[PDB]
């Protein structure tokens, strides 16, 4: 049924033993059906599945859904299949789907599913014509039934970006849904770009003179303060 | 629910872990602000009822329709004043609750979730209540640290319905 | 319950044929196989207790944790039970002796036994073991070759007996693991 | 998952009150011992490992049978299951002991568990030997009059002594 | 084994043994052959206390009771009434569990069949308070049950899977998570060993659980337990619910399916023998590429509800983990 | 993430060294200094909505275009979004508030944002002006002598005002 | 780093919401321990090339073998005595800032990660490291509190390499 076709592969943090023994920090906690949470923390893998897939400002109290949480909570699902029927749930689809250009809704699933980024701009195209054929459930499907998802995640656990931060470093990797955030650089072009944003540029003004020049001692002032 | 010790325990055990030196310390820490959070508490319980009815008082005074509303919502029958008690009531348990606790566990547990469902369904305004939270603020009575351990969940609420 | 002959009726009967000559042949087989299988069968159950007491004996006399303080022969009582069980899984191989099929042992020993052993909290391993010594002992005493008691029998051929009765002690043995 | 506060403050709602000032004054007593809890807990954690390989060493000497081929002790991944097991039975009794009320302990560990060591032959009744051999142990540690004010403990010893025969009352 | 050979589904069950029937069919005392009261007084044994296990010791104790069967004193009856009064079937049954247990033991030994409503468990316990021990035992042989199936001539039997004695559909499941087969006994089984009530939640809320039969796969398995919700607080994450309620019945119908050993060992991810995290010996599934050493499933017995349409799916993953199902029942 | 004290064992270590007398006694003073600090982060927290509602009346009013159509506030979704951008800078500036270094609101806030408001045609100019809106607002609500005693907190106002900067200099 | 500041800060941005009231109580218990961490931390820089000098001459005394051995890995040169003293330098450094931070976070950091891999790959073992942490624990001559604070993080270190 013309498979997925080989791509090449990269090499980022997902895939080392990084030992972190008696780990100190940048575990998500862990929210998972297997600890038997009470109602709380119930409550916590809930809100947190939603950010994860929705994530921040999408999840809202009208995009929030009450049925597939009193299924979760008395116990007719799985968290993976909360998951899934999250993404099919189309107030996803309005805002993250019908805007993004299909290569683009690529990197928001293999990567706010997985917790991976891309490994090439194969990976997008290959995975872009089995959601642009299949449908978007077909595609949801090979991502969760992946050998990979189970490897890691298995039945009951909300995914998290894998390895964003090392244990000796501060930075990292920018969190995924600051970097992937819905609208594509190039989405708007095709419609009228956004117009009456200048009030902004006014609020804020510097003149000419003002400005550093180079050789200036005051330019390198931050670095100062910062010693 | 959400303590300052089932937090740090639940933590460590989500890094599979033995309580290290640092959980303790935050234990510490809750016995020794613990004392004043009682002093508080008590306080509260000892005159529980009059800052209910000057609460509901106030509602009152500040929105003089409520008591004039031919509406069953409304305190303008034998029952919304009683009901209207009830709720202000409410608050003040819980309230009482988080100071002995020492987080907002039993508030975000037994009242904070689900609220906006309530409140948009009975046509329950989210003021009337700030209101009451207000005069309750101003009229607990408590000095020093006790007053910042009321005065912290109290506007904590307020932060809820705003 | 069902001998050789239910067996054929059953497979013939989802078959919802007759028996035939070819089934009937290789029953034929085992009436002349019969008296072989009686004077096998009087091996077995003749110093059957005998049987019992090496093989337990030499359950606890390799593997000496069963007797030490807290192991599951270690009480009197525990013992008892320990040497009835050994006598109640030979008695129900000396049926499927008799029977020539499996299914007195596979429908009333074998079934349940895995989660009465594991809910007692019975090695299963050492069971296994003892369901061995009861194999190789059973086969040495129907072949005539025990070293205590060598009894008269006319002399003859029985290799696919004792093919049979260590198929149902294996089965025994794979049934506790 | 409750500590010693949550739980009178469920029961406190439950029945829609407020907490009653004979309730506040027997917590100010728990609060005002607290001190002794942490220490404790930490006399524990200190040494923690140290505890299970011991009570392993005199598991496996008084009891022979584990070690050996055919038994659970024997294989080197079970083995290793083994005191596993052990070090995270530990790891939840000193939970509890901090939380002062056996809710995490019976929740995440505890539960179900009995059935399991059902599903994988365990002599679970060996397992409540193991448990009995950590606290022993871990008594003896907690009972340790040195680096620390001299005092009164019996009260929370028996404290710790409950959990430990919560955990060998559950799995057999 | 299988329902279709042999055509009886009842053997196959695990309860073809107990067909036998022991009715006394000789009048007037016998003084001397001593052999059908010798197996009729087996017989009592045997279903009395359950195929538990009774010592030359243990036959001291109801000595008296026995030569009272051996004369015209005791029907059998009145000498099974005898047996359950007695120091031995106190220290089994009573003693060791709660009367809830002890009620549903009772009915196992004495009727055969379970207790179907919580109205039986009611009538019993309240004997049992007004009077005590004895009364509670004489309520159950005095009462027209017994007198009517057994007609104090026949030693008692399992009826409660017939269909004949009157009881809810649920007493027929719940009559075969009682009995287990011919080996499994009251010490034995682990959903009923001393203590533990057999029935709780099932027992009381008349729950009919399906039937994993005896042997295979699903020979050693026993139900995770549920707790209620935010009301009376409880773990959510223990097991499947039984009911599977909304929109998912899309996709084909639910099924219920229980998985019955789940094992580290067990587990493999589809390719055999054991897969090793790190170079040197580190076996458990690595969490964030960190070692974690907690177990990959974590307790031996998960369900699975599943629609229809990811039946297959579903039915592959178990059997690449190494469970094993126990019973499949369309919800 | 660092706080004020790995940051210093952190260049300490990553020199291999130990403390030396100067910097521990700096330390100390830090530590001498930290209920202030602890009060100015309860004196935001427990006004937070407060100040978010009010910094954006004020923003729409003096800058009309955005809630207008066309604008960023003038869709309803937009607008709660746009509401819950400035609820969310202002809690990265209460985390650095408490860990004293500009640790957490550099990597997981600040860190790839200007980049973000330029793919999604938001003015981060009118961002930075929000938050010289919020900047106001939370001082002012720092400097509030009611229920705490009375003292000398210019140190730490001019510090939290440095995170309010850093905030309004990294979205343009 | 794992502080206990930093881990509250991590648990509350887990949970998306400003830090409350049980945070600061953790950040509260962390400062009032902090001076007795403090009188600690300086008394171990204070004499701390005794205290390597004395734990590598004990586990010499204890190990008589190491001086002995002919091989890359053992003290038996001029070389294996100066990385010897060396490593145990880096244990006590280690401890001496988690003194002054307040959890073992810079151990588990700097120190614990992949350490059983040097000991694996390099022949280490834990034994000689842990009779070098022995000595230094009957000899630092703490007193009181700050040998508490002190002792538990040696401690630590002694779980981790048993
Ligand atoms: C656990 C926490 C908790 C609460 C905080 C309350 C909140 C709450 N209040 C009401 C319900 C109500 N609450 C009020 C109260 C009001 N009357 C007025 O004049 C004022 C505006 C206001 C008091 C300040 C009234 C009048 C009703 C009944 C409304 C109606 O039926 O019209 C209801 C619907 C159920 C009911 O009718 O009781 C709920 C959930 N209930 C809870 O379980
Ligand atoms: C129809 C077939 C049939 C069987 C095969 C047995 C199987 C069986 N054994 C026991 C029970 C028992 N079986 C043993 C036997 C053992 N002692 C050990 O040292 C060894 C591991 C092992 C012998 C090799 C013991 C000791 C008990 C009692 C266990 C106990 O009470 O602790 C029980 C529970 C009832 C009882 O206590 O008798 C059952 C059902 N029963 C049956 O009805
Ligand atoms: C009621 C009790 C009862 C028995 C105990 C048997 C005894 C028995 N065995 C055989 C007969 C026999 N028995 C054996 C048995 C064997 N020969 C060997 O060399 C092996 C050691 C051994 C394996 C079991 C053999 C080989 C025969 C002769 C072959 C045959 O008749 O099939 C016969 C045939 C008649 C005769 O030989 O005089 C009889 C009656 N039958 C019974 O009815
Ligand atoms: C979250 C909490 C949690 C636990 C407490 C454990 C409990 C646990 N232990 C085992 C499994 C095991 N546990 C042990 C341990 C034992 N070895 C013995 O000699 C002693 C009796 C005992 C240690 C005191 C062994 C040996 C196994 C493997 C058993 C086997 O495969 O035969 C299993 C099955 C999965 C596996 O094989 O790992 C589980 C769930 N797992 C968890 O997830
Ligand atoms: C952050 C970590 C942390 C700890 C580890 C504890 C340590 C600790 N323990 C006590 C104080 C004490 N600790 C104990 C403990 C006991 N005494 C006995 O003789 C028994 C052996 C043992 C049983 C547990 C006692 C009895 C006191 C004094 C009584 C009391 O203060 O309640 C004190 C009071 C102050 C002082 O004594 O100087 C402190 C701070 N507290 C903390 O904040
Ligand atoms: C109070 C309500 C009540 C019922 C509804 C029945 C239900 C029921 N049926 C059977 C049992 C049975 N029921 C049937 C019936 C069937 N034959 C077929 O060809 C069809 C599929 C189906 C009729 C539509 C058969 C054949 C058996 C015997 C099955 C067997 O032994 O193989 C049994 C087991 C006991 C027995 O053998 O009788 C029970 C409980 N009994 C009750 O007490
Ligand atoms: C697809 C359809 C569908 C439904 C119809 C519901 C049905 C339903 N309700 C609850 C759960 C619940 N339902 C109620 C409702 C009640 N409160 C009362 O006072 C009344 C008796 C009753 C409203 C009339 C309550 C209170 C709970 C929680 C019960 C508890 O936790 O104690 C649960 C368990 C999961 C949960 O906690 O949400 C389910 C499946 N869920 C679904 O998915
Ligand atoms: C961890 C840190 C973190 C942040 C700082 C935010 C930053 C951020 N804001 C938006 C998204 C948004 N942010 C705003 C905010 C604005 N409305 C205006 O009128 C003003 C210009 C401005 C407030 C000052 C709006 C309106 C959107 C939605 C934009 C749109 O969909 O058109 C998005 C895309 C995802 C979403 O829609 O929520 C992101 C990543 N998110 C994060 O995860
Ligand atoms: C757990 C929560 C928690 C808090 C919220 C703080 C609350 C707190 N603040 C102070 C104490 C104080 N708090 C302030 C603060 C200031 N005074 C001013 O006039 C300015 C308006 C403001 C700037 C921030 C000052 C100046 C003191 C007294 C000086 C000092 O103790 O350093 C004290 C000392 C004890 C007392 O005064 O009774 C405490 C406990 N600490 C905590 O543990
Ligand atoms: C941050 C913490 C930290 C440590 C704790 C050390 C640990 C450490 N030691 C060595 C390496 C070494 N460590 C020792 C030390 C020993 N000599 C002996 O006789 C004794 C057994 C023992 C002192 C008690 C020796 C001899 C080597 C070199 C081994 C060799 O090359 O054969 C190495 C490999 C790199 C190297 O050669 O330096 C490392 C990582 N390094 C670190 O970065
Ligand atoms: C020191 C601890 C110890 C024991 C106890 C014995 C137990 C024992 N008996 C065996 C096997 C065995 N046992 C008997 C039964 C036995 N022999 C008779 O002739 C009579 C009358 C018997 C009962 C009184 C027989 C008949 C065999 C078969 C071997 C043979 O031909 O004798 C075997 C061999 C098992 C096998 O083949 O796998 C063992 C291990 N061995 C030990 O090491």
């Given at each position: 049924?013309?498979?997925?076709?080989?791509?090449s592969?990269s090499?980022?943090?997902?895939?080392?033993?990084?030992?972190?023994?008696?780990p100190?920090?940048?575990?998500?906690k862990?929210?998972?059906?297997?600890?038997?949470?009470?109602?709380?923390?119930?409550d916590?893998?809930?809100?947190?599945?939603?950010?994860?897939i929705?994530?921040?400002?999408?999840?809202?109290?009208?995009?929030?859904?009450?049925?597939?949480?009193?299924?979760?909570?008395f116990?007719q699902?799985?968290?993976?299949?909360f998951?899934?029927?999250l993404?099919?749930?189309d107030?996803?689809?309005?805002?993250?789907?019908?805007?993004?250009?299909?290569?683009?809704?690529?990197?928001?699933?293999?990567?706010?599913?997985?917790?991976?980024?891309?490994?090439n701009?194969?990976?997008?195209?290959?995975?872009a014509v089995?959601?642009?054929?299949q449908?978007?459930?077909?595609?949801?499907?090979?991502?969760?039934?992946?050998?990979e998802?189970?490897?890691?995640?298995?039945?009951?656990?909300?995914?998290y970006?894998?390895?964003?931060?090392?244990?000796?470093?501060?930075?990292?990797?920018?969190?995924?849904?600051?970097?992937?955030?819905?609208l594509?650089?190039?989405?708007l072009?095709?419609?009228?770009?956004?117009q009456?944003?200048?009030?902004?540029?006014?609020?804020?003004?510097?003149?000419?003179?003002?400005?550093?020049?180079?050789?200036?001692?005051?330019?390198?002032?931050?670095?100062?303060?910062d010693? | 629910?959400?303590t300052p010790?089932?937090?740090?325990?639940?933590?460590?055990?989500?890094?599979?872990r033995?309580?290290?030196?640092?959980?303790?310390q935050?234990?510490?820490?809750?016995?020794?602000?613990a004392?004043?959070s009682?002093?508080?508490?008590?306080?509260?319980?000892?005159?529980?009822?009059?800052?209910?009815?000057?609460?509901?008082?106030?509602?009152?005074?500040?929105?003089?329709?409520?008591?004039?509303?031919?509406?069953?919502?409304?305190?303008?029958?034998?029952?919304?004043?009683?009901?209207?008690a009830?709720?202000?009531?409410?608050?003040?348990?819980?309230?009482?609750?988080?100071?002995?606790?020492?987080?907002?566990?039993?508030?975000?547990?037994?009242?904070?979730?689900?609220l906006?469902?309530?409140?948009?369904?009975?046509?329950?305004?989210?003021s009337?209540?700030?209101?009451?939270?207000?005069?309750?603020?101003?009229?607990?009575?408590?000095?020093?640290?006790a007053?910042?351990?009321?005065?912290?969940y109290l506007?904590?609420?307020?932060?809820?319905?705003? | 319950?069902?001998?050789?002959?239910?067996?054929?009726?059953?497979?013939?009967?989802?078959?919802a044929?007759?028996?035939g000559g070819?089934?009937?042949?290789?029953?034929?087989?085992?009436?002349?196989?019969?008296?072989?299988?009686?004077?096998?069968?009087?091996?077995?159950?003749?110093?059957?207790?005998?049987?019992?007491?090496?093989?337990?004996?030499?359950m606890?006399?390799?593997?000496?944790?069963?007797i030490?303080?807290?192991?599951?022969?270690?009480?009197?009582?525990?013992?008892?039970?320990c040497?009835?069980?050994?006598?109640?899984?030979?008695?129900?191989?000396?049926?499927?002796?008799?029977?020539?099929?499996?299914?007195?042992?596979?429908?009333?020993?074998?079934?349940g036994?895995?989660?009465?052993?594991?809910?007692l909290?019975?090695?299963?391993?050492?069971?296994?073991?003892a369901?061995?010594?009861?194999?190789?002992?059973?086969?040495?005493?129907?072949?005539?070759?025990?070293?205590?008691?060598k009894?008269?029998?006319?002399?003859?051929?029985?290799?696919?007996?004792?093919?049979?009765?260590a198929?149902?002690?294996?089965?025994?043995?794979?049934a506790?693991? | 998952?409750?500590?010693?506060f949550?739980?009178?403050?469920?029961?406190?709602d439950a029945?829609?009150?407020?907490?009653?000032?004979?309730?506040?004054?027997?917590?100010?007593t728990?609060?005002?011992?607290?001190?002794?809890?942490?220490?404790?807990?930490?006399?524990?954690?200190?040494?923690?490992?140290?505890?299970?390989?011991?009570?392993?060493?005199?598991?496996?000497?008084?009891?022979p049978?584990?070690?050996?081929?055919?038994?659970?002790?024997?294989?080197?991944?079970?083995?290793?299951?083994?005191?596993?097991?052990?070090?995270?039975?530990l790891?939840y009794?000193?939970?509890?002991?901090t939380?002062?009320?056996?809710?995490v302990?019976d929740?995440?560990?505890?539960?179900?568990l009995?059935?399991?060591?059902?599903?994988?032959?365990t002599?679970?009744?060996?397992?409540?030997?193991?448990?009995?051999?950590?606290?022993?142990?871990?008594?003896?540690?907690?009972?340790?009059?040195?680096?620390?004010?001299?005092?009164?403990?019996?009260?929370?010893?028996?404290?710790?002594?409950?959990?430990?025969?919560?955990?060998?009352?559950?799995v057999? | 084994?299988?329902?279709?050979?042999?055509?009886?589904?009842?053997?196959?069950?695990?309860?073809?043994?107990?067909?036998?029937?022991?009715?006394?069919?000789?009048?007037?005392?016998?003084?001397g052959?001593?052999?059908?009261?010798?197996?009729?007084?087996?017989?009592c044994?045997?279903?009395?206390f359950?195929?538990?296990?009774?010592?030359?010791?243990?036959r001291?104790?109801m000595?008296?009771?026995?030569?009272?069967?051996?004369?015209?004193?005791f029907?059998?009856?009145?000498f099974?009434?005898?047996?359950?009064?007695?120091?031995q079937?106190?220290?089994?049954?009573?003693?060791?569990?709660?009367?809830?247990?002890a009620?549903?033991?009772?009915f196992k030994?004495?009727?055969?069949?379970?207790?179907?409503?919580?109205?039986?468990?009611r009538?019993?316990?309240?004997?049992?308070?007004?009077?005590?021990?004895?009364?509670?035992?004489?309520?159950?042989?005095?009462?027209?049950?017994?007198?009517?199936?057994?007609?104090?001539?026949?030693?008692?039997?399992?009826?409660?899977?017939?269909?004949?004695?009157?009881?809810?559909?649920?007493?027929?499941?719940?009559?075969?998570?009682?009995?287990?087969?011919?080996?499994?006994?009251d010490?034995?089984?682990?959903?009923?060993?001393?203590?533990?009530?057999?029935?709780?939640?099932?027992?009381?809320?008349?729950?009919?659980?399906?039937?994993?039969?005896?042997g295979?796969?699903?020979?050693?398995?026993?139900?995770?337990?549920?707790?209620?919700?935010?009301?009376?607080?409880?773990?959510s994450?223990?097991?499947?619910?039984?009911?599977?309620?909304?929109?998912?019945q899309?996709?084909?119908?639910?099924?219920?399916?229980?998985?019955?050993?789940?094992?580290?060992?067990?587990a493999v991810?589809?390719?055999?023998?054991?897969?090793?995290?790190?170079?040197?010996?580190?076996?458990?599934?690595?969490?964030?590429?960190?070692?974690?050493?907690?177990?990959?499933?974590?307790?031996?017995?998960?369900?699975?509800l599943?629609?229809?349409d990811?039946?297959?799916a579903?039915?592959?993953?178990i059997?690449?983990?190494?469970?094993?199902?126990?019973?499949?029942?369309?919800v």
């Amino acid at each position: 049924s013309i498979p997925v076709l080989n791509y090449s592969l990269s090499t980022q943090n997902q895939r080392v033993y990084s030992f972190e023994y008696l780990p100190n920090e940048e575990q998500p906690k862990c929210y998972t059906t297997d600890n038997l949470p009470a109602a709380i923390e119930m409550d916590q893998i809930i809100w947190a599945a939603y950010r994860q897939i929705f994530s921040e400002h999408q999840l809202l109290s009208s995009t929030r859904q009450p049925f597939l949480e009193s299924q979760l909570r008395f116990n007719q699902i799985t968290v993976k299949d909360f998951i899934k029927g999250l993404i099919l749930s189309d107030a996803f689809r309005y805002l993250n789907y019908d805007v993004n250009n299909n290569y683009r809704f690529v990197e928001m699933c293999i990567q706010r599913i997985l917790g991976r980024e891309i490994y090439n701009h194969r990976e997008k195209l290959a995975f872009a014509v089995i959601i642009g054929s299949q449908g978007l459930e077909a595609f949801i499907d090979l991502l969760i039934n992946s050998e990979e998802y189970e490897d890691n995640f298995g039945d009951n656990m909300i995914p998290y970006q894998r390895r964003r931060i090392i244990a000796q470093r501060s930075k990292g990797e920018i969190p995924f849904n600051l970097k992937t955030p819905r609208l594509g650089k190039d989405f708007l072009y095709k419609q009228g770009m956004p117009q009456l944003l200048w009030a902004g540029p006014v609020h804020r003004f510097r003149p000419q003179e003002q400005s550093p020049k180079a050789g200036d001692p005051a330019l390198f002032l931050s670095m100062v303060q910062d010693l | 629910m959400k303590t300052p010790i089932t937090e740090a325990i639940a933590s460590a055990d989500s890094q599979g872990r033995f309580l290290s030196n640092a959980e303790l310390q935050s234990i510490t820490g809750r016995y020794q602000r613990a004392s004043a959070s009682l002093e508080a508490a008590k306080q509260l319980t000892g005159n529980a009822s009059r800052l209910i009815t000057g609460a509901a008082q106030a509602v009152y005074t500040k929105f003089p329709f409520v008591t004039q509303m031919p509406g069953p919502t409304y305190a303008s029958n034998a029952i919304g004043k009683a009901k209207c008690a009830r709720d202000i009531g409410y608050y003040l348990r819980m309230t009482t609750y988080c100071l002995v606790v020492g987080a907002t566990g039993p508030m975000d547990e037994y009242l904070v979730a689900g609220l906006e469902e309530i409140n948009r369904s009975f046509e329950l305004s989210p003021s009337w209540y700030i209101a009451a939270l207000e005069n309750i603020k101003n009229d607990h009575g408590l000095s020093g640290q006790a007053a910042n351990e009321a005065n912290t969940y109290l506007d904590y609420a307020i932060n809820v319905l705003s | 319950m069902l001998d050789a002959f239910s067996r054929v009726v059953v497979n013939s009967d989802s078959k919802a044929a007759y028996v035939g000559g070819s089934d009937l042949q290789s029953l034929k087989t085992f009436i002349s196989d019969g008296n072989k299988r009686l004077d096998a069968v009087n091996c077995i159950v003749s110093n059957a207790s005998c049987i019992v007491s090496d093989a337990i004996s030499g359950m606890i006399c390799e593997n000496p944790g069963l007797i030490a303080p807290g192991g599951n022969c270690y009480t009197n009582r525990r013992m008892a039970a320990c040497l009835r069980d050994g006598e109640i899984i030979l008695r129900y191989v000396s049926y499927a002796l008799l029977a020539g099929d499996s299914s007195v042992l596979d429908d009333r020993c074998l079934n349940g036994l895995k989660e009465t052993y594991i809910a007692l909290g019975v090695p299963t391993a050492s069971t296994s073991r003892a369901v061995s010594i009861m194999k190789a002992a059973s086969t040495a005493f129907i072949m005539n070759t025990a070293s205590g008691r060598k009894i008269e029998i006319a002399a003859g051929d029985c290799q696919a007996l004792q093919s049979e009765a260590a198929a149902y002690f294996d089965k025994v043995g794979s049934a506790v693991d | 998952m409750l500590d010693a506060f949550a739980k009178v403050v469920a029961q406190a709602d439950a029945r829609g009150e407020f907490l009653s000032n004979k309730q506040l004054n027997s917590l100010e007593t728990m609060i005002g011992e607290g001190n002794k809890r942490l220490d404790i807990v930490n006399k524990i954690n200190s040494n923690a490992s140290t505890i299970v390989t011991n009570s392993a060493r005199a598991l496996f000497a008084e009891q022979p049978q584990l070690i050996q081929p055919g038994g659970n002790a024997y294989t080197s991944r079970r083995m290793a299951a083994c005191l596993r097991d052990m070090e995270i039975v530990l790891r939840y009794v000193s939970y509890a002991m901090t939380a002062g009320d056996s809710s995490v302990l019976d929740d995440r560990c505890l539960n179900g568990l009995r059935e399991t060591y059902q599903a994988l032959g365990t002599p679970g009744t060996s397992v409540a030997v193991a448990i009995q051999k950590m606290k022993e142990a871990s008594i003896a540690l907690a009972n340790d009059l040195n680096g620390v004010p001299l005092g009164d403990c019996s009260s929370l010893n028996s404290e710790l002594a409950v959990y430990f025969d919560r955990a060998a009352a559950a799995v057999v | 084994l299988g329902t279709v050979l042999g055509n009886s589904s009842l053997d196959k069950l695990g309860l073809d043994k107990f067909v036998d029937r022991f009715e006394v069919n000789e009048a007037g005392r016998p003084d001397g052959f001593s052999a059908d009261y010798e197996v009729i007084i087996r017989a009592c044994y045997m279903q009395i206390f359950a195929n538990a296990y009774i010592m030359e010791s243990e036959r001291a104790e109801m000595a008296k009771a026995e030569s009272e069967f051996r004369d015209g004193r005791f029907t059998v009856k009145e000498f099974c009434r005898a047996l359950a009064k007695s120091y031995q079937y106190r220290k089994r049954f009573f003693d060791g569990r709660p009367l809830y247990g002890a009620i549903e033991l009772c009915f196992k030994h004495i009727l055969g069949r379970t207790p179907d409503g919580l109205e039986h468990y009611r009538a019993k316990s309240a004997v049992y308070d007004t009077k005590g021990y004895e009364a509670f035992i004489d309520a159950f042989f005095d009462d027209g049950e017994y007198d009517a199936f057994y007609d104090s001539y026949c030693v008692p039997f399992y009826r409660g899977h017939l269909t004949t004695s009157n009881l809810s559909m649920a007493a027929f499941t719940h009559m075969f998570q009682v009995v287990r087969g011919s080996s499994t006994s009251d010490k034995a089984n682990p959903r009923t060993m001393t203590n533990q009530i057999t029935l709780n939640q099932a027992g009381i809320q008349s729950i009919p659980l399906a039937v994993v039969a005896p042997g295979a796969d699903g020979a050693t398995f026993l139900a995770p337990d549920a707790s209620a919700g935010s009301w009376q607080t409880g773990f959510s994450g223990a097991t499947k619910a039984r009911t599977s309620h909304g929109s998912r019945q899309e996709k084909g119908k639910m099924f219920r399916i229980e998985v019955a050993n789940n094992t580290q060992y067990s587990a493999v991810g589809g390719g055999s023998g054991i897969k090793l995290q790190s170079r040197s010996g580190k076996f458990y599934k690595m969490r964030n590429m960190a070692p974690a050493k907690v177990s990959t499933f974590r307790r031996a017995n998960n369900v699975y509800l599943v629609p229809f349409d990811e039946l297959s799916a579903t039915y592959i993953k178990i059997h690449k983990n190494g469970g094993s199902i126990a019973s499949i029942t369309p919800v």
